[PDB]
Amino acid sequence: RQVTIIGAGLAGTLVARLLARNGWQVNLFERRPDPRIETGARGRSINLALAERGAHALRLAGLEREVLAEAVMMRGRMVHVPGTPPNLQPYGRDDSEVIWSINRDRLNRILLDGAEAAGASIHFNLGLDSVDFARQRLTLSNVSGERLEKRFHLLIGADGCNSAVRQAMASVVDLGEHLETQPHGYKELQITPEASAQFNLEPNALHIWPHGDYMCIALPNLDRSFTVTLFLHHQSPAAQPASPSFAQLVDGHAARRFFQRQFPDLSPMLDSLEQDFEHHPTGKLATLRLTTWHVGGQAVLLGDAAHPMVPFHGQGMNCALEDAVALAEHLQSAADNASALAAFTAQRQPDALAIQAMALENYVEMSSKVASPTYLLERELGQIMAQRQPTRFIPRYSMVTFSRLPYAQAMARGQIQEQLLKFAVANHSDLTSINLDAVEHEVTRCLPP
Ligand SMILES: Cc1cc2nc3c(=O)[nH]c(=O)nc-3n(C[C@H](O)[C@H](O)[C@H](O)COP(=O)(O)OP(=O)(O)OC[C@H]3O[C@@H](n4cnc5c(N)ncnc54)[C@H](O)[C@@H]3O)c2cc1C
Ligand SMILES: [Ca+2]
């Protein structure tokens, strides 16, 4: 059985391994050069957060141990707000509930090796330009545009948030796209190993500097450096042209003054702020929803190609790897490819919609400069319900991050929990006046184990 995959990223490489291992003849085409060919170019420092959904996908693929050996454990959140050295907010009760910070390039290289070890053939420096579905032929080209045509039988679009496969499908079907732009851009910055140690930055934690309409995060690297991401509006809104935005930060010097004013405890840690600000490109964020993910039995999308989401829940890669497991499962045991692609789409679409929604919602959580007293009291009561009924009351962030519960169910159960806590806390200023056993009875009544 033959399959062509476009995009040797995270989902495309994993699905290539899973199919090749199961006897498929896999050809994988990648626009970029092979990152395993060492050059004299600058290293790639972006990292991301691997959680249970992605880890489990790697586990099934037999690659989890190799990946985790190069990942830094993040035990909890370190929230930096002015005047108060932070304390770790642990993610869970022990080190089984942690998130892993992994270098993106290293992860991609491990997956590339894994796909080839299973028998897939990978062809780099070839970007998909167009698809002729009627003649079953692809057109690819290198950076110079030197075209090259290939016959295909099954086409998997694993080619990212600006997928060319998706574009080609839109020529033969109505994808029913809903693009929702995000006002934040993002900028990568760096904290050196020396600086992070000088300022006693905890390596085994995810760090956040909330600031309302903008914020910075930092994820650790194995060498104690941190990769920092600034999230900030591209443009200053209409009824407030003075508020910060990338448009005001015309160069590295301006970025420094902005950081010294708004992130005074972080600015000293960013030695190369000016250079990194001007060198690294400002990224764009968006949510894109597709009614249609496949064309008959001929082509299917997965990962960012199928459902771009904002990065504020750290689940895009995790979702994409979950996608890859499901697609290989359906393709392996379906009656035919068309049946597989329809069943895969029907299964995954409700969950993709849910994590897209929860990711949007999580920005307020991350960027909030202070938690209202009514927020802390609900959280505290939720903690208590979790101890009495660890089988029933599980905070939504934990369901999303540390379990494989389908995203949609996690969102629905979170809704029940949110309303339960809200009514239970209203008109009570502290825990001592809340009828705790009544709350638990409501938990048991409304949340099945
Ligand atoms: C700032 C930011 C932070 C994030 N943090 C996290 C996080 O902490 N945790 C998490 O789980 N997710 C995170 N994400 C999301 C995550 O990066 C993506 O969801 C994930 O990379 C998607 O995997 P993918 O394989 O579908 O696409 P990609 O990993 O992007 O792979 C696509 C591949 O296709 C190639 N390609 C593109 N176009 C073509 C073409 N025309 N022809 C051939 N090849 C092509 C690309 O070069 C690339 O190799 C973050 C995203 C952003 C923007
Ligand atoms: Ca994400």
Author numbering: 8 to 456
Could you share sentences copied from the article?
Kynurenine 3-monooxygenase (KMO) regulates levels of neuroactive kynurenine pathway metabolites associated with neurodegeneration. Downregulation of KMO activity shifts the flux between the two branches of the KP toward increased KYNA formation, thus generating a neuroprotective environment. The KMO reaction is a random bi–bi mechanism proceeding through a ternary complex of KMO-bound to l-KYN and NADPH (steady-state enzymatic assays are described in Supplementary Methods) with a turnover value, kcat, of 8.2 ± 0.2 s−1 and Km values for NADPH and l-KYN of 16.9 ± 1.5 and 12.1 ± 1.4 µM, respectively. We next determined crystal structures of KMO in complex with the novel inhibitors or with l-KYN to inform the design of small-molecule inhibitors capable of penetrating the blood–brain barrier.
